[PDB]
């Protein structure tokens, strides 16, 4: 399973959640930004490591980071 | 029943230089101007991608139509230059008198920095670079006898070039055809079959019957070129033509009375090669273009335009419906009238395959006088038109995948031939995958078997004619059948179409023009290498087209586009999944496969066909070493590459020294390309950061932020340099070799 | 002489080399006419070949056992024995031109940084400004040194971006 | 490579007594290609030929063996993972649907080499082919000439 | 579902496969091993004899080729055995089990070598 | 909102079939089922290749991996404005529901969700790799 971390520079644009092709991320309420919402990564066991979320994050440096880790059938994206 | 008619719009666009001063105007993304150096590359990459600038099909079609006029105008400038340089900087007039001893030349260099040594001694009291384009042979066949005639054609070429550029401007800025005009496919085929190909063939037959045949009949008889009648004297004076061809004494009455046998003297069916010049009979060539003219003119009356009679192309497609293919060819007509990429994919495929067929037929049936005995021209023309065909075919795969990503719509394709092909793509690629593995083992493995057996001192265990044999029995049967065709299956033909099938050799000026080609074990082995390398190229390109939209790895590959680098390091890594990357990989294999084709041709001709005729017999350039040596990889390395590269590496200090320089320079460009292929832009962007720091330290940092090339541009830059270096290396090696010995 | 070399004017191999090149040209000449176009071109080449070998000997170059000119790069050996024109003098010839080109480009780049849209002044060159800066670059060594002493040649370390460390 | 070419060519000319060849031909790159690589390959590539073989046939064989491993390395360096992973997926489909072969099955799911692995595998082939090609040429050219 | 096709789904093809030893259930794995081993073993001798390094020797060609076919059957038997060890470590047919496959591999060795020997007897 | 229950007898779209469908994995490890309601019969693109017609009313499809189900979901939502949902089905017969986990698509913020894998710091405030060395396994500074 890969590791996905959300850092406190998130502005709650939701672009990472829309970009993710496996519904790994979601938005949750927060008080640390104007949007009052923060990205969350509750389902990292389904993450494949494409890093489409990082491509979509506007903040600099990124507020969502993916650290490729142990491989499995789900993280290796196998249908066999 | 929409009538076929001319339809245009008046003054669609304004002619101004305003947009010439605003780079990127065509695209919304680039119109804002540059911020990073990546903008500059994006400007040139997307300039001619009309389909992405606008979503309007009519606007796309109008740009394509005028961009084609620009291509035609450029060819006329190029053609005009070739005719002009023949008139002013060539030894053509001297060549006509002594074609067998004088080397064609049409380029002269200025005496600067000591480059005048490239002006070699070519004959006729002339110094210049020897040319292998075969223009002298073409001009002789058409009947050109003076540099004035060459000069007038060049001036006409420039007028045509000006007309082509005017037409492009006129049909884009002044009177632009509408979309409904472009979609008359029935009308276009009628005009292009009977009008372009049909009347073009008939018109050229008129030139050959009235100009080429009389002029070449006297040239072969030995008449001095300056003393031959001018082409207009032949046209105006039927008395002169009657002397050369008595059939002209009867005028055109035989044509209208159906006594076509009267014209047997200049409309022949001889076959074979003209013994004096070693090229095809021009009387045979005239009857060819007369027959081809009638066939195409009939072909141009097949499709229905405005008067009921004819065929509807949509109706033909929808009637061909079988039990095994569901709906069938339904929906193809709408695909092929609304997608330029789909049309381009088909046309590139067959146009490229045609260029390869031209290469085989022109060497085997030399159509011009003194083309065969000029070994440099034979080698160059075959190699040139094979490379052109190779690139076009790879483009056919590229633009088939573009159609699949952009112009493909599932709603219009349900259970038709196109849909059903996508639904068993795993079956197709898995089977084609196995065929390539099978062909690689049983063709290239044989060479490895022979190399190991030879190194072990076991020649009796090799695959060869003196050992275990692999005879192309099927090809040998066909060679014999065509050799005996004039006896029973083509009774009215005097000779076989080519001397490759069998018979006796034709020698012109002491050199062999063509002789029977024998197929043995080495020919069996090399041919199955061709089948292997062609099948692999199909696998790569066909795989890209079938999996352009989705695969078991990227289920939504279409949304990513046609040209993207990857979908990230996830799923183990997805580098080079896009259909664009299947063209990128397919280019390498096409280059690999055609390189063996032109090495096969070069070694086989020098070993078995080309040579000098003497009293005892034929001595070939490489002395018939193809049969015994080309069955091992070591044989190719030693006997072909190492031995024949002697000419190019000893070229310094002579008129061929330029080929030596380009031989090294080509080796350099090829190796330079591996830098882009073996690396990635991550390293280079960090390197530029340190370089930018030095410029910042000196207040000399640019306003347009330097950026390492994109991932895709690294692959494009790599393959372009890889191809240029590799192909130029063979080009120098072939010409310096064949010109030196051939 | 220097490093065992000998003046080309006194070198046996150097003289023999000239004959070989002229002999090659003469051999091609005798297959043409006296005043035909090819013959005139070949004669012109032979004149340049003879002039070239006289000039190199007159220049006082050094030839090795190969009988080809060799160049001296050490400034002390060059000025000691009058070989300053081989490498030493051309060294300062190139640097003046190289600094000229670089200094002119740097002046233009600074000039447009003050404009509203510097990027559009780089793809589309401001030719009137470029010509003005092209002529003023002849005095770059004087201007370059004065910038160095006044401390405006280099940026401050605090105004340059750097990566984490 | 440049160091060992320089050492080898300067010594071959010394060992033959004709140092002038290096002094004259080493100043331009055609001399290296012509008078060093091409000239000294004559005996190597004749180790075995259609007429027979000699003691150099092992180095002749190893010479081509090196070129093959070197060229194979280009495949791992030029073509990257995404192409091969999708190709392997049709091979997995083909095995499962083939009668009399789907009785046998794998325990480790086939996948393409990783991104990092292929760089090492490509570099290993590149290096091995590099070494074996020059080792065969270095020994064969030197030993046949004098030994 | 999966793309229907006559090759994948036809009556004549299905019946032929169902009669092959691999698919003929109800037979002891050892007996299926012998039946399969005999067929492959008999064929395996052909190519070695005709195209082996000693093919042109009058009488040694038969012996050398068959002796090499016997060797390959031995190597294949090892492949079958270790495959069962790896695959079955913990279903309808007895063959696809640790006990069944071990018997299957043993039968293949006995049948395969018998087929190679039987092929030799045919020649001489 | 309550967790939907899968109906195995739901009709499936009109599709001829292809070679890009389920493999032996579905019979041994898991597969995925996506269901949705269709307003009218329409043609859509299968992520496995080809075109299928969706029946009016409920539809059901089976796919080999999760990404294939969520690829079809994006197509149905963006173009046809539908609201599909898919499950994970195990060979033992168990059915697991997901997407939408709580009934609301993750792009929209919803009360009751608990933040996961959220670090209350920036990327630049992680510790150095030396400080997480010999922790029993390869651990990034971001993990701690
Ligand atoms: C066969 C060669 C060829 C042809 C026919 C065209 C044709 C075209 N190009 Mg292209 N182009 C080419 C090669 C070619 N290009 C190459 C090699 C490059 C470099 C990668 C480009 C880069 C390029 C750019 C950047 C642009 C074009 C544009 C155009 C279009 C308008 C040109 C125009 O008005 O010219 C008028 C021509 C004349 C008046 C002739 C006389 C003057 C010239 C300079 C001589 C037209 C479709 C422009 C466009 O609008 O594209 C959509 C545009 O912006 N081209
Ligand atoms: C495909 C097109 C093509 C090409 C590649 C060439 C190439 C060449 N031409 Mg040709 N030429 C062409 C078309 C072409 N020409 C046409 C259509 C005409 C008719 C106007 C001419 C008329 C022409 C003349 C009159 C001359 C050349 C010459 C030259 C040479 C020097 C050009 C040069 O540096 O000019 C200088 C560069 C710039 C002005 C920039 C060069 C080999 C020269 C030559 O071969 O001299 C011995 C020469 O005198 N060409
Ligand atoms: C002087 C006449 C003229 C003028 C002022 C314009 C003006 C315009 N044209 Mg028009 N056009 C003209 C002639 C002219 N055109 C001609 C002769 C043709 C026929 C080919 C066309 C065909 C044409 C098309 C199809 C289009 C335009 C478009 C345009 C607009 C932008 C063009 C642009 O950015 O060009 C700048 C581009 C260049 C300077 C590139 C020149 C390319 C030519 C063909 C030379 C190719 C040389 C070749 C690469 C040589 C080999 C290179 C190698 C040695 C390195 C603008 C309104 C575009 C438009 O309206 O878009 C909305 C558009 O799509 N024009
Ligand atoms: C008998 C009629 C006829 C002829 C001879 C042609 C010829 C040609 N067409 Mg076609 N075309 C026709 C009818 C015809 N067309 C009709 C009726 C339609 C509408 C359905 C089209 C629509 C069409 C398109 C959309 C395109 C062509 C193109 C071409 C060219 C392809 C390249 C080639 O082979 O260049 C060979 C070159 C030559 C033979 C020399 C130059 C052309 C000579 C002078 C023939 C001119 C033919 C012209 C139609 C006559 C009237 C011109 C004007 C006075 C009105 C070629 C010149 C392509 C092209 O390149 O366009 C620029 C292209 O894009 N045609
Ligand atoms: C397109 C191809 C082509 C063309 C253009 C020609 C042309 C010609 N052929 Mg050839 N020919 C061809 C193909 C062609 N041929 C083929 C395929 C064959 C093999 C079957 C032959 C076999 C052949 C033979 C056997 C003969 C010719 C002959 C001729 C010439 C006279 C024909 C004749 O009597 O015309 C009769 C009349 C016409 C063609 C009509 C002319 C209409 C004019 C141009 C109208 C002008 C109107 C205008 C308004 C007036 C000007 C006004 C202005 C000044 C103000 C003529 C030069 C004859 C000849 O003399 O050969 C040397 C001849 O004997 N041809
Ligand atoms: C009839 C021929 C034809 C036509 C009309 C087109 C047209 C098109 N192609 Mg296609 N293509 C063709 C043949 C053709 N192609 C062939 C034969 C191949 C195989 C190589 C391809 C491969 C291909 C790819 C892979 C792609 C296209 C794309 C495109 C589109 C954009 C091209 C562009 O912007 O180029 C702009 C032009 C340039 C940047 C200049 C390229 C310069 C080359 C690399 C120089 C090579 C060396 C030079 C020839 C000689 C030495 C030069 C010297 C200075 C050293 C356009 C619709 C692109 C696209 O997006 O389509 C939708 C795209 O991705 N084509
Ligand atoms: C010399 C270099 C080289 C070699 C040997 C190969 C080999 C292969 N390539 Mg590759 N390739 C290369 C360079 C090379 N490539 C380069 C430079 C590129 C980048 C452009 C690519 C890009 C590329 C692509 C994109 C594809 C291939 C494909 C293939 C395969 C073709 C079919 C096949 O299985 O043939 C049979 C195998 C061979 C001929 C290899 C040598 C076999 C030897 C001689 C005999 C066997 C040895 C024997 C068992 C003894 C072993 C003893 C030992 C175990 C102790 C094959 C594995 C295609 C593929 O996979 O098709 C299925 C394919 O799609 N290649
Ligand atoms: C790139 C480094 C380099 C090297 C390796 C040499 C090497 C040499 N130089 Mg050169 N030189 C160089 C750069 C170099 N120089 C530069 C940059 C300049 C200034 C533009 C000079 C100016 C120069 C002069 C004026 C003289 C030499 C001389 C010499 C020779 C002996 C003294 C010497 O320099 O010892 C080793 C070099 C160094 C330690 C580096 C600094 C050398 C200084 C600048 C010059 C020392 C001269 C010395 C005191 C002369 C004493 C008399 C001598 C006969 C023993 C020797 C061949 C002398 C000569 O011609 O001898 C035959 C001599 O008279 N050099
Ligand atoms: C040969 C096969 C012909 C097959 C042939 O003619 O079939 C004929 C058959 C045509 O059936 P229908 O009568 O229903 O077709 C109506 C047509 O008008 C198309 O709609 O085509 C198919 O079934 C398509 C799939 C064939 C699948 C073939 C698989 C084997 C491929 C082998 C390739 C070998 C290449 C050798 C090159 C020299
Ligand atoms: C589409 C159709 C295009 C047709 C183009 C036709 C161009 C014709 C140009 C040549 C004119 O010449 C053509 O007619 C002349 C007049 O009958 C013929 O002239 C011939 O017969 C005349 C009869 O009085 C004699 O005086 C001539 O000496 C004799 O040569 C030419 O032999 C024929 O070639
Ligand atoms: C070398 C290299 C680079 C660096 C190469 C770059 C940045 C291209 C350099 C192009 C030219 C030389 C720079 C621009 C020149 C200007 C147009 C100004 C020139 C002015 C005059 C001298 C003409 C990559 O960016 C790269 C990316 C992906 C894979 C491999 C590689 C790769 O190998």
Curated annotation (Swiss-Prot), chain A:
Ligand binding ([4Fe-4S] cluster 2): 20, 47, 50, 53
GO CC terms, sorted: chloroplast thylakoid membrane; photosystem I
Localisation per UniProt entry: Plastid, Chloroplast thylakoid membrane
Documented effect of changing residue 34 to D/E: Drastically decreases affinity of PSI for ferredoxin, limits photoautotrophic growth at medium and greater light. Decreases cross-linking of ferredoxin to PSI-D and PSI-E
Alphabetical UniProt keywords: 4Fe-4S, Chloroplast, Electron transport, Iron, Iron-sulfur, Membrane, Metal-binding, Oxidoreductase, Photosynthesis, Photosystem I, Plastid, Repeat, Thylakoid, Transport
Chief location: plastid
Residue sites binding [4Fe-4S] cluster 1 per the record: 10, 13, 16, 57
Assigned EC number: 1.97.1.12
Cofactor mode of binding and number, as noted: Binds 2 [4Fe-4S] clusters. Cluster 2 is most probably the spectroscopically characterized electron acceptor FA and cluster 1 is most probably FB.
HAMAP family assigned to the protein according to its UniProt record, in alphabetical order: PSI_PsaC
Assembly mode: The eukaryotic PSI reaction center is composed of at least 11 subunits.
Name the UniProt record assigns to this protein: Photosystem I iron-sulfur center
Top-level taxonomy: Eukaryota, Viridiplantae, Chlorophyta, core chlorophytes, Chlorophyceae
Curated annotation (Swiss-Prot), chain C:
Location of the protein in the cell: Plastid, Chloroplast thylakoid lumen
Keywords noted in UniProt: Chloroplast, Photosynthesis, Photosystem I, Plastid, Thylakoid, Transit peptide
GO cellular component: chloroplast thylakoid lumen; photosystem I reaction center
TM ranges: none
A biological process term (GO) from this entry: photosynthesis
Signal peptide: none
Family: Belongs to the PsaF family.
Function: Probably participates in efficiency of electron transfer from plastocyanin to P700 (or cytochrome c553 in algae and cyanobacteria). This plastocyanin-docking protein contributes to the specific association of plastocyanin to PSI.
Name the UniProt record assigns to this protein: Photosystem I reaction center subunit III, chloroplastic
Organism, scientific name: Chlamydomonas reinhardtii
UniProt gene name: PSAF
Swiss-Prot record, chain D:
TM ranges: 56-78, 120-140
Subunit structure: The PsaA/B heterodimer binds the P700 chlorophyll special pair and subsequent electron acceptors. PSI consists of a core antenna complex that captures photons, and an electron transfer chain that converts photonic excitation into a charge separation. The eukaryotic PSI reaction center is composed of at least 11 subunits.
Subcellular location: Plastid, Chloroplast thylakoid membrane
Residues of the full protein shown: 589 to 735 of 735
Annotated residues for binding of chlorophyll a B1: 67
Binding site for phylloquinone: 84
Top-rank taxon: Eukaryota
Effect noted on mutating residue 67 to Q: Impairment of P700 function. More severe
Taxonomy of the source species: Eukaryota, Viridiplantae, Chlorophyta, core chlorophytes, Chlorophyceae
Name used for this protein in its record: Photosystem I P700 chlorophyll a apoprotein A2
Swiss-Prot record, chain F:
Keyword Nucleotide-binding carried by entry: no
A GO-annotated cellular component: chloroplast thylakoid membrane
Keyword Signal: no
GO biological process: photosynthesis
Location (main, coarse): plastid
Keywords per UniProt: Chloroplast, Membrane, Photosynthesis, Photosystem I, Plastid, Thylakoid, Transit peptide
Disulfide partners: none
Membrane topology: Peripheral membrane protein
Subcellular location: Plastid, Chloroplast thylakoid membrane
Function, in words: PsaD can form complexes with ferredoxin and ferredoxin-oxidoreductase in photosystem I (PS I) reaction center. PSAD may encode the ferredoxin-docking protein.
Family of the protein in this entry: Belongs to the PsaD family.
Name by which UniProt lists this protein: Photosystem I reaction center subunit II, chloroplastic
Species of origin: Chlamydomonas reinhardtii
